[PDB]
Structures are given as structure tokens and as C-alpha cells.
Amino acid sequence: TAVVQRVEIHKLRQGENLILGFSIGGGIDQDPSQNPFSEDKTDKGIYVTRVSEGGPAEIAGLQIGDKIMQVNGWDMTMVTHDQARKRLTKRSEEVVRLLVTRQSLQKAVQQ
């Protein structure tokens, strides 16, 4: 099932840029059947596809496969890929709070 996670990322300056340290796939203009992380292959949402070792996203607890619902409160469930990318990389914002859902499993079914 999907568990809600609220992640708070503090962007890291790397030269000219403030980076988050992850990659995204998805968006309403992309082919959802190509998403290896979604449960529903018609899900055109924004997904975390990679997370950088030691980057802000990793430290904040973001995980590959996470579905991004909100960025600082902008809905990310029905945006284009570029729109998603732009909301995440606003240089004026050094803190980004993400609402995500995470495919999760009841552990220790036996013990």
C-alpha cells in the first residue's frame, strides 16, 4: 500500500546551482507505461527515479520510486514533466517540502 511521507529538503549549493540530488520521471506529457515504479501504468504522476549518494534528497529520506504529490504545496499529480522540474528548481527557494507517497509493505509477516 501507499504510505504518506513528508520530506523536507534543504538545497545544497553546488557552484551556481542549488541542487536537490535526485532525478524525476513522469508527467502528463510522458508515457506512463514506461514507469517501472508505478502500481497503475496509467499513472502520469511525478516519480523519483534516482537518488544521489550524500545529496540533500537522500539525507532527507527521499527514496527511488516515491511519488511526488506536492512541492511546497504545488500539486504535482497533473503537471507536465517540465512543469514539475521547474517547481523543484526555483532558485529562490532553498527549502523544499515534498509530500510523497511510498509503496510499502507490512514487514515481519512471520517472526
Binding site: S23, I24, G25, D31, Q34, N35, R50, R85, T89
Partner: peptide, 6 residues
């Protein structure tokens, strides 16, 4: 499946 690095 394009991805973007941020």
C-alpha cells in the same frame, strides 16, 4: 522514459 536531474 526521459528523466531529469535536479
Amino acid at each position: 522514459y526521459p528523466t531529469s536531474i535536479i
